[PDB]
Amino acid sequence: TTALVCDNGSGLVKAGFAGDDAPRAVFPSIVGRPRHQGVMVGMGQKDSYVGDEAQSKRGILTLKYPIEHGIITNWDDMEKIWHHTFYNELRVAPEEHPTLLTEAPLNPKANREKMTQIMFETFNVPAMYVAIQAVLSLYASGRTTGIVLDSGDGVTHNVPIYEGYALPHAIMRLDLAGRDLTDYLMKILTERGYSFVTTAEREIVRDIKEKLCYVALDFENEMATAASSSSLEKSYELPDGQVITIGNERFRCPETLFQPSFIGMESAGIHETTYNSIMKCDIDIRKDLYANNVMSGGTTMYPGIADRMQKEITALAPSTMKIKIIAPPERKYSVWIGGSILASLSTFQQMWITKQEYDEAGPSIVHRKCF
Amino acid sequence: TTALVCDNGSGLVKAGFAGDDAPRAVFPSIVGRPRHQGVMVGMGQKDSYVGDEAQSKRGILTLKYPIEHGIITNWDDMEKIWHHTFYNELRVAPEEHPTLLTEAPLNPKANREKMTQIMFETFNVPAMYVAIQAVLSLYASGRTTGIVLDSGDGVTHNVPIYEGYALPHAIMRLDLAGRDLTDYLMKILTERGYSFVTTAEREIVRDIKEKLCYVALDFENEMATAASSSSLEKSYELPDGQVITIGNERFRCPETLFQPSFIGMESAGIHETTYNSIMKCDIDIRKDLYANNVMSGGTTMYPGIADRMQKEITALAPSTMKIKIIAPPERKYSVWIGGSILASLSTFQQMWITKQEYDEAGPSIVHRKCF
Amino acid sequence: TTALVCDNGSGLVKAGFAGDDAPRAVFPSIVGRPRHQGVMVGMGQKDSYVGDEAQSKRGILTLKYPIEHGIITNWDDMEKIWHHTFYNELRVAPEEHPTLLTEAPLNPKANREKMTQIMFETFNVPAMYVAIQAVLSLYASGRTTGIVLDSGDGVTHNVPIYEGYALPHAIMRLDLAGRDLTDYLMKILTERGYSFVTTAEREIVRDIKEKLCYVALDFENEMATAASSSSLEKSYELPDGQVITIGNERFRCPETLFQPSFIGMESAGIHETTYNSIMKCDIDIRKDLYANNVMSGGTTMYPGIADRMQKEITALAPSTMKIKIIAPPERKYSVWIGGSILASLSTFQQMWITKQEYDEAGPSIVHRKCF
Amino acid sequence: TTALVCDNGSGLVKAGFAGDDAPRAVFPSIVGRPRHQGVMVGMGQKDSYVGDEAQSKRGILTLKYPIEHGIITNWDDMEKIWHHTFYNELRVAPEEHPTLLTEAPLNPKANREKMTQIMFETFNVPAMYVAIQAVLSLYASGRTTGIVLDSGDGVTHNVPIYEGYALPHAIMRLDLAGRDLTDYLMKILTERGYSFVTTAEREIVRDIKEKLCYVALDFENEMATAASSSSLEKSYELPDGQVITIGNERFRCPETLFQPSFIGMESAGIHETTYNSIMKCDIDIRKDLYANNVMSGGTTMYPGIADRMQKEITALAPSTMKIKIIAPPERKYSVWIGGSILASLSTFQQMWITKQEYDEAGPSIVHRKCF
Amino acid sequence: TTALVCDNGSGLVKAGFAGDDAPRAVFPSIVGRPRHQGVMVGMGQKDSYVGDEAQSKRGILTLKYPIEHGIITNWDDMEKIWHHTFYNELRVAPEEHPTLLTEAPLNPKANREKMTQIMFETFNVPAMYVAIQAVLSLYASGRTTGIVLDSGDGVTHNVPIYEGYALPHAIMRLDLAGRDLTDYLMKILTERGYSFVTTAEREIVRDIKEKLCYVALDFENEMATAASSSSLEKSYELPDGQVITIGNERFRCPETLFQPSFIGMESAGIHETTYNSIMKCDIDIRKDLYANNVMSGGTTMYPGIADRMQKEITALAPSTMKIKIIAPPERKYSVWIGGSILASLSTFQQMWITKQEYDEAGPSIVHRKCF
Ligand SMILES: Nc1ncnc2c1ncn2[C@@H]1O[C@H](COP(=O)(O)OP(=O)(O)O)[C@@H](O)[C@H]1O
Ligand SMILES: Nc1ncnc2c1ncn2[C@@H]1O[C@H](COP(=O)(O)OP(=O)(O)O)[C@@H](O)[C@H]1O
Ligand SMILES: Nc1ncnc2c1ncn2[C@@H]1O[C@H](COP(=O)(O)OP(=O)(O)O)[C@@H](O)[C@H]1O
Ligand SMILES: Nc1ncnc2c1ncn2[C@@H]1O[C@H](COP(=O)(O)OP(=O)(O)O)[C@@H](O)[C@H]1O
Ligand SMILES: Nc1ncnc2c1ncn2[C@@H]1O[C@H](COP(=O)(O)OP(=O)(O)O)[C@@H](O)[C@H]1O
Ligand SMILES: [Mg+2]
Ligand SMILES: [Mg+2]
Ligand SMILES: [Mg+2]
Ligand SMILES: [Mg+2]
Ligand SMILES: [Mg+2]
16 A cells, blocks of 8 residues: 655665655664673663664764665675564565665666565565665656756765656766765864864764865855854863864865865866766757756755756856756655655656565666666 | 648647647657667567657668658558557547648658548548648738748648649659758768768758758858858857867758759759749749748758748849748747648538548549649 | 682772672781870780771771782781681681682783792682683673673773683773772861861761762762752761762762762773773774673772763764663672682582692792783 | 878867878877866876877866867867877877878868868968768778768768768768766666766776677567676776676676666667668668678777677568678777878868968868868 | 985874885884983083984983874874984985975875975975875785774774775774873783883883783683793893783783774774775775785784784685785885885976965965875
C-alpha cells in the first residue's frame, strides 16, 4: 500500500511514508563505535551506536559515515542504519511496504546493485525503486524543466532536465560538498587558533558551519571589511562553554564552493559547473534552463548562496538570459519530498522493481529502468 | 461542401478551407522524436512531437522532415502530420470534406499514388485532387500566362503556362532550394566561427536566414564592400543570448540560388534555369513569358531576389523583351491561395477524384487527370 | 554464593558481604609491633597486633601501614591483615566465597598480581576480582557518568567515566592524600608548639584532623580573620588531658589539597587536577562531566571541601558550564558500597576470575579483564 | 632551403624537416601552469611548463590545450608551444626556413589568419603555407583518390579527393574526436568505480585509452559476452600502483565513434559520416571513393577500427561496391608525413606564401590559395 | 651580512649562523622558576633560569615550555629565551643580522604575527623571515620532492612537496609528538613501579626515552617476546643512583606514534597520516612521493622508526610503489640545516621581510609571502 520513501543520503537519513509532506525519521548517517575500552559491567553497553544514539554518545565513539562522496562504502554499517530506520525509527514492517531509495547520478553501478540486493534479501522488501536525487528534487519544486543543483554532504551535482527529459551527457558531478566544507573549517579554524581534530569535533564543526557560515556576495570585498572591522566577528558556544570567535572563516568556508582551489580541488566552482552543464545542453533549451535553476540540498541552505550564484552565473551567461534561481524553503528535504510525490503517483506504480522481477532478471534490472 | 486545401509542402504545412483568403493552420512539417531517454515518470511524455510541438521541444528532439526535395519519404511521419493537420489544427472531420493536395511537378509517380491511397484509406476523404503547386501559384496571381518560379524549402521549379496551357516539356526542376540554403549557412557560419550542428541548430539557422539574408544586386561588388566596411555586419540573437555577428554570409548564402556551384551543384542558377525554360518554349510566346515572370514560395521572400533576378534575366534575354517580374506580397502562401481559389471554382468541381472513382479505376486515376 | 567485598584501602580496611548496605568489618590497616622489650612473662604477649588491637595498644607499638600511596609494600603484613579480616572480623570461611578487592588506578601491575596470588594461594578463594575504586564509587552514586574524585589516605585520583566508558588517558593520580595531610599537621602543629613525633602521635593527629579541620572557602581571607580574632581557635583533648589549641592550622592543613606546594608537592591542587582531567576528555562530553563531579573517599569528608572545590572549578571552567558536585552522605564508604552493588549484579558474575582460570592462564589474567 | 613541417595538431605537436620520414619533435600540445602556490625559493620554478615538461610535472599543473576541436583558442599559449617547438625541440632558427602548418578543413578563417600573422611577425618565417590535414594524409598514402578520414584528438573529418580534386561540398566535419572519447572514459570509468577528475587524471585516462580500448566488431554481441565472462576484463597500472580493472568500457568507449549518441552527440557515427560524404559526391566517382577509404590520425589506431568500419560501410553501401579501407602503419603521423612529402615537391615551391607577398596582399592571401 | 638561523622549536632552541653546517647554540626551550622560597641571601639568586641553566638547577625549578604543540603560548618566557639565544649563547648583536625563524605549518596566524612583532620591536632585527620547518628539512636533504615527516617534541607534521611546489591541502598535522611520548612514559613507568611526577622528573624521563626506546618492527610479536624473556629488559641509571629496569615500555612508548589510541588520541598513526597525505596528493605524483619519504626531527631518531614505517606504508601502499624512506644522519637538525642553506642562497635574499617593509605594510606581510 504505502511506500517508504527513504532518502539514504550521506549525512542525514531521511525516511517517511509516501504521501507525507515531511520525513518522520530524520537522523544522521553515522555509526559510532566505542573509542575506549569500557568498564561498567552492568551498564548495557552496545558494540555500536547509530544515528541519534551516536550523537548523544559522540565523544566516546569513533564516528563513521558509511557513505562517502555519495558512495556506500561500509556496507555492514549501512545495513545497520537501514535496520534502525525501519525498525526503530519508523517502526514499520519493511516486508509489507515498497521502498524508494535514492542515488546521486554517476554513482558506481555496484552501489545500486549491492543496495538492491540488501533491500530484497535482508529486508524482504515487496518492491523497490532507486531514483536519482536531482530528479526527485525537481518533482518537489513541481517543475518539468530546470537545472537541479543538488548539493548535500556527500556530493554536489547538476542535472539538466528539460520537459521531463534528463540530459545525461550534461550531468555534472563534483565531489566537493558539505563534508569537505566541514573539513575545510577544521583547517581554517586551526588558523584562527582552535584545534578541532576528532570525529566528534568534526561533528561540532558541522554545527558551527550551519549557524555561522554565509556566502559573501563579493568575496574579495568581504575580505577587505572582514580584515578591517570586527562587525563580522561572531561568537559561538561549543558543547564545552569555550566560546569560539569566528570572522573571516564565516565566509571563507562556503566560498570554497565557488573557489574549490581553496581545498586543492582542481574543478571549477559550482557556478561554473552549473554553467558548463548548461553549455553542454543544446542551445535550443538553454534559455529555459537559465530561468529554472533549482537549488536544493543542505549546502544550499547557506545564507546568500542563491544571491551569490545568481550574480556569478549572470556574469557567465549572455546578458539577456534572465538567470533565475529557485531556492524554496524546505529545499533541504526536497529530495525526500520529491520521493513522497513520486511514490504517490499512479503512473509511477509501474516503475517498481518487484522481488519476483528482480529474482528473475537479476541485478542488471536496476539500471535497465533508469541510469 | 467546403474543401480543405492542404498545401503539404516540405517545410510548412499550410492548411485551411477553400474560400478563405489565408490558411488557418500553418505549422512546420516536422516530426520530432526524443533525442534523450526521459526520466520523469508522470510527465506525460510523447513518443513523437509534431509541428509546433516539435518546435517548442526542439532541443531534445531529433527533427525529421518527412518530405525531402519535394518527395515524401517518411510516409509514417507524413501520415502523422496530416493527422494533426486535420484533427488538432483545423479540427475538422476529414470524411465530410473534399481535399486538395499539392505537388511539385516531376515528383515520382509513387509519391502521388501513395499519398492518394492514404487520403482515401486513412482519412476516408470523400473526394480528393492533387494539383501542381506552380499552377496554383499562377491562379493566386490571377494570371493565365507566365513563368511560375516556385521555390520552397524542398525544391525550386519553373513551370511555363501560356493562356491556361502548361508546357510540360519546358518544366524545370532544381533541387537546390531553401533547405540547401539553410545548410549552406550552417557551413558558411562555421567559416565565421559558429558551430551549428544539430537539427535543432539547423532550425535556428533557418530563423537566421529569414531575418538577415538578402540578395546582393551585384554579388561581386557586394563582396568588395563587405570585405571593406562593417556596415553590412549585422548582429543576431539566438535562443541563447549568444549574439551572432554576420556579414558576408548575409548575401553569400542566397547567392547560391544564382551560383549553385557554391554548394557543388552543377546546375545553372535560377536566373538561367528560368531563362532556359523560356528558351524551350516556342518563340511565339516567349515575349509574354518574359513579361509575366511570377515568383512565389518562401525563398522568393529574400530582399532583392526580384531585383536581382530581373537584372540577371535582363542580361540573358534579348534587350527589348521587357522583363517583368511579379512578386506580390503574400506570395509565400500563393500556392495555398491558389488552392483556395481553385477549389472554390464551379468548373473545378468536375476535377475531383471521388472515393468511388478511385476504388473503381485504381491508383492510375491520379495521373490520368493531370501530370 | 555471597561475595566478600573487601576494600583493602590504605588506612581503613572495609570488608563485608555483597548485598549489605554497609561493611561489617571496618578497622585500620595497621600492623603494630612492640616498640619495647616486654617483661611480663605470662601476659600472653603477641609479636604483632592488628587493626583495632594496634589501636588499643598503640603507644607501645611501632605502627606500620602495609600500604603506602595505594601500593601494598609490606606484603607480609598485608597478608596478616587479610587473615584477620576474614577469620577474626568477618569470621567467614574465605574458601567458600568469591571476593572483590580494589585498587587505585595506575597502581603497579605487580601490586595486583601479588595480591591475586595471595587470594588464591593463601586463602583459596573460589573466585576473585579486582576493581578500580573510582569505578566502584560511581556505582555507589548510581551514575554512569561523572568525574570520580576518590581521595583516601593513600592516594587521590580522578577517573572520568562517561556512560559506562572509563577514559584511561585522562585518569589523574596524585599521591597527595590523607596521610600527607596528617603529616602536614604534625609539621604545622610543631609551629604552634606541639611536638607530635611517634607513629602513635601521628595517629593522634589523624583524630585531630578529622574533627577540627575544615576547608576555607577563601583561604586568604580566612587567614586574615584567623590572624585577627580568636573565633577560629578551637580546643582539642588528647588521650592525655593536655588540651591542644588549634587555629590557623584548622584550615591550613586541608588547604594543601588545593595548594600542594605547601608540602613541596609540584602538582597542581585537586581542583586543577580534576579540571585538567576533564580537559583531557573530548569536548563532546565535558559538559556532562562538569555536571557530575562525584566526590568520595575519606578526605572528601572535610567540611566545605565540596563548596570550595565548586568555587575553584567554577573559576577554572567556562562560565555557563554548570559545575555540580556530588558529595553524598556515606561517600566515605562509597567504594565499598559500590563493591557490594557490583558483586550483587547478575551481569557481573561473568567477571569473576576463577581459581581454575587463574591457574590455567596465569597472573596476566588480572589485567586482561580491566586495567 | 629545408622546410620545417609543423603539424600543429590538437594534442600532439609533430614537427620536423621536410625530407625526413618522421618528425623529430613529437610532444603534446599542452601548456601547464602551477596548480599550487610554490614554496621552494631557489628551485628555479617556471610560470608555465610546455609539452614534455608539462607531462613530467603534470600533477601540480593545470593542463590546458591551446587547441580545442581543431581551433586555436588560447593564442598566447599556442605561441609558446611554437616557440618551444622551434627553439628547444628542433633547435632551428625559424627565420631561415619556410614552414608548413596544417588545419582541419572548415576551421574558422580567423584561425588561419591569426596563425599566419604569428608566423610572419613573431617568428619571421621567410615563407609559409597552410595545408589541409586530410589532403596531406592522402599524399602520405601516395594516392590521388580517396576518402580521407582523419580523426585526431580535436576533430574528425572526411575529405573526398578525386584524382587530385578535393570536393569541398562533401567535406564532413565532426567534432566528436579523441578528446571526447577520453572524456567519455572518465565518465564511464566513474560507472565502474574510478574517480578520474583532474586534468592530470584526464591525461592518465588518455594513456588507458590508448592501451586497452579496442573496437568491437559487433558491439551488441560484444556486450553480451562482456557481461557474461571475465575474459574481456583487463588490468591497468596507474602512475600510482592502484590497478584499474576495465571490461565493458574497453569497447564502449571507442564505440562512441559509431554511436555518438553515447555522449549526447546528435550526429551520425563516422561510418555514416563517411558514407554520407560519398553520397554527396557525384555517382560517377563513388566507386573509386569506396575502394580508397583512407584512414589516418591517432584515433584510427584503435584495434579493429578498420574492420569495424569496413563492416559498417559494407552494410550501408550498395553491395558490389567493394569497400576497401586503407589503414597503413604509421597513419598516426600521416599528416606530418604528407607535409614532408609536399614540402619536398618541386612543384609545391610555388605555393609558398612569402613574407613579402603577405605584407603586400594582407591576411586574405592565406585563403586565396586553398580553402 | 650573515643571517642568524634560529630554529625556535618546542624543546630545543637551535641557533647559529647561516653558512654553518651546525648550530652553535643548542639548548632546551625551558624557562624555570624557583619551586621553593630561597634563603641564602648573598647567593645571587635569579628569578628565572633559562635553557642549560634550568637544566643544571632543574630540581628546584618549575620547568615551563613556552611552546606547546608548536604554539608559542608563554610569550614572556619565549622572549626571554630569544634574549639568551642572542646575547648569551651566540653573543651576537641581533640588530646587525637578518634572522630566520621557523614554524610548524598550520600554526595559528597570531603565532607568527606576535613572533614577528617581537623580532622587530624587541630585537630590532634588520630583516626577518619565517619559514616552514618541513620545507627547510627538505632543503637539508637536498631534494625538491618528497614527503617531509617532521616530528619534533611539539608537533608531528607531513608536508608534501613536489618539485618545489608545496601542496597545502595535503598537509597533515598531528599534535601527537615527542612530548606526548615522554608523558606516556611517565604513565607507563608508573605501571612498572616508578613514580615520575615533577617537571624535573618529566625531563629525566626524556633522557630515558632517548636512550632506551626503540621501535618494534612488529609490535605484537615484540610484546610476545618481551613478556617471555628478559632479553629486552634494560637497566638505566637516574641522576639518583636508583637503577630503573625497563622492558615492555622500551617499545610500547614509541609505538604510540603508530597506534595513538594508546594515549587516547583519535588520529591514525603517523604511517597512516603520511599515507593519507599522499592520497590527498594527485595520483600523478604519488609515485615520486612514495620514493622520497623524508623523515626528520628528533622523534625520528628512534631506532628502527624508519624500518617500521617502511613496513607499515609498504602494507598500505599499492605494491610496486617502491616505498623509500630517507632518514639521514643529523636529521635531528635538518630543519636548522635547511635554514642555514636557505639563508645562504642568493635567490632567497629577496624573501626577507625588512623592518621598513613590515612597518609600512603591517603584520599581514608575514603571511603574504608564504602560508
Ligand atoms: N542550515 C544549514 N546551513 C548550511 N549547511 C547545512 C544546513 N543544514 C544542513 N547543512 C549541510 O548539508 C549537509 C546535509 O544536508 P543533506 O543534503 O540532507 O545531506 P545528505 O543529503 O548528504 O544527507 C551537511 O553538510 C550539512 O552540514
Ligand atoms: N522571409 C523569408 N525570407 C527568406 N526565406 C524564407 C522566408 N520565409 C520563409 N522562407 C523560406 O522558405 C521556405 C519555406 O517556405 P515554403 O515555400 O512554404 O516552403 P514549403 O512550400 O517547401 O513548405 C523555407 O526555406 C524558409 O526558410
Ligand atoms: N570525617 C573526616 N574528616 C576528614 N578526614 C577524614 C574523615 N574521615 C576519614 N578521613 C580521612 O580519610 C582517610 C581514610 O578514609 P578512606 O578513604 O577509607 O581511606 P582509605 O580508602 O585510604 O582506606 C584518612 O586520612 C582519614 O583521616
Ligand atoms: N595507439 C592509440 N590508440 C588509440 N588512440 C590513440 C593512439 N595513439 C594516439 N591516439 C589518440 O589520437 C589522438 C592524438 O593523435 P593525433 O592524431 O596526433 O592528434 P592530433 O593530430 O589531434 O594532435 C589522441 O586522442 C590520442 O589519444
Ligand atoms: N636520540 C633520540 N631518540 C629519541 N628521541 C629523541 C632523540 N633525540 C631527541 N629526541 C626527541 O626529539 C624531541 C626534540 O627534538 P627536536 O626535533 O629538536 O624538537 P623540537 O624541534 O620540537 O625542538 C624531543 O622529544 C626529544 O626527546
Ligand atoms: Mg541528499
Ligand atoms: Mg511550397
Ligand atoms: Mg579508599
Ligand atoms: Mg591531426
Ligand atoms: Mg623542530
